[PDB]
Amino acid sequence: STGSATTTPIDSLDDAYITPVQIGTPAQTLNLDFDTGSSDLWVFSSETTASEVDGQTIYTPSKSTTAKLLSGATWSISYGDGSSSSGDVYTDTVSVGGLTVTGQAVESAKKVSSSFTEDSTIDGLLGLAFSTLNTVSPTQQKTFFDNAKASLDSPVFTADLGYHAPGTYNFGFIDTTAYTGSITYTAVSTKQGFWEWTSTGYAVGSGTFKSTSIDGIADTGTTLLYLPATVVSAYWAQVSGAKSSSSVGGYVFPCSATLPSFTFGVGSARIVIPGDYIDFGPISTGSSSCFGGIQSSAGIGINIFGDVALKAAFVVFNGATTPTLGFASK
C-alpha cells in the first residue's frame, strides 16, 4: 500500500504545516502537525477542557463506531518549546492520504497548554519519530508509520515541504518526479528516538564550505534551523545590523536586509537554503526588526534541522531494518 497527502503551511511564515487525517467511522477529518521529532498521535477532542479549545476541530470518539477506549492508558508529553498536553487513549481507524491503519492509538487530549489553544489551525500532532519515544503508559504505543510499515510497498515516508506553498507527505514510495539529481543517503542513530544524523558541514552564501561534523535531528515539527553557536554567528555576521537579542530570544536582523543562503552538507552532497527561507518577518506587527530562521542550539542540547532546512530538500525517512535518511535537492 501507499498514501499521499498534501501538507499546507498554517500561515504566511510557514510556522508549521498541517495535513488532513481521517479518524474514525464515519471519518472525522482533523488537520494534524506531522512531527518527525515526536512519537504521539494526539488530538483535540470532546474530552478537552472546554476553555482550552479555541477554534480547533475535535475528535469525538463516541461518534466513531470503530473507537475503543484503551483501558487504563494515559499519556503526557512536553515539547522542546515548553508546550504540553495530556489525556487518555482510544484505538481507532486512521487514514492519511488513502493509507489506512486499523487499531491506531489516538491519544485524546484532556488538557493542552496555552500555545496549543492559541493555534486554531492545529487540531493535534501525528508523531513520526521512533516509537520508543511514545508517552502512553503503562503500555507504550506505536506510531502511525510503525503500524503501517509492514503493509507499505517500501518501508519509507518522504517529506516534501513547500516554501510559502503546499507540499507533500508520501508513505510507502519515493516519487522520483519530486526532486532533482540524486538522493544522498546518510546514517541514522535511533539511540535518542529521533531521526538523528550527522551533517558534513556548511557554507554561508557564496563562501567556502567548512567541513565539520554536525550531529542533529531531522524534525518536521520544529519551525527553525538550530545549529551550534559558532555556525550561527558565522551566518549572521554576513548580515549588516544582525544581532542576538536576549529580549527577543534570538538573532534578529533589519527587515531591509537581503539574507544570504545557507548550505548544509549531506555526505558529499549539498543542500542550499535560499536566503528568503531564513526570514521570519517582523518580531512584532509593524516592527522593522525581523526574526531569523537560523538560531543557536546552545542550551537546547541538540541541533535541529527543522522546517527551514527540510523545506529546501526532498527528504526520505527510510524505516528499513537499519534506518537511514535521504536528502535531494528539488
Describe this entry's structure for a reader.
With 330 residues, the chain is mainly beta. It has 2 domains: 5-174, Cathepsin D, subunit A, domain 1; 175-330, Beta Barrel (Cathepsin D, subunit A, domain 1). The chain is built from 4 helices and 24 strands. A hairpin with a 2-residue loop joins β6 (84-96) and β7. The two termini are 25 Å apart. Disulfide bonds join 255-290. One of its GO terms (biological process) is proteolysis.
Question: How helical, in percent, are the residues?
Answer: under 10%
What is the third-level CATH name, the topology of the largest domain? Cathepsin D, subunit A, domain 1
Query: Strand pairing plus helix content: what structural class?
Result: mainly beta
CATH architecture group name of the largest domain: Beta Barrel
Biggest sheet character: 7 strands, mixed
Number of helical regions: 4
Strands of the widest sheet, in order across it, are 18-17-12-13-22-14-21
How many domains make up the 3D coordinates?
2
Cα shape:
globular
Task: Kindly provide the name of the CATH class of the largest domain.
Answer: Mainly Beta
Q: Span from first to last CA?
A: 25 Å
Report the β-strand fraction as a percent range: 35-45%
Evaluate the radius of gyration.
20 Å
Structure at a glance:
The chain is mainly beta and 330 residues long.
Q: Main attributes?
A:
monomer, 330 residues, mainly beta, Cathepsin D, subunit A, domain 1, six-stranded mixed beta barrel, 24 strands, 7% helix, 44% strand, globular, disulfide bond, zymogen, EC 3.4.23.22, Endothiapepsin, aspartic-type endopeptidase activity
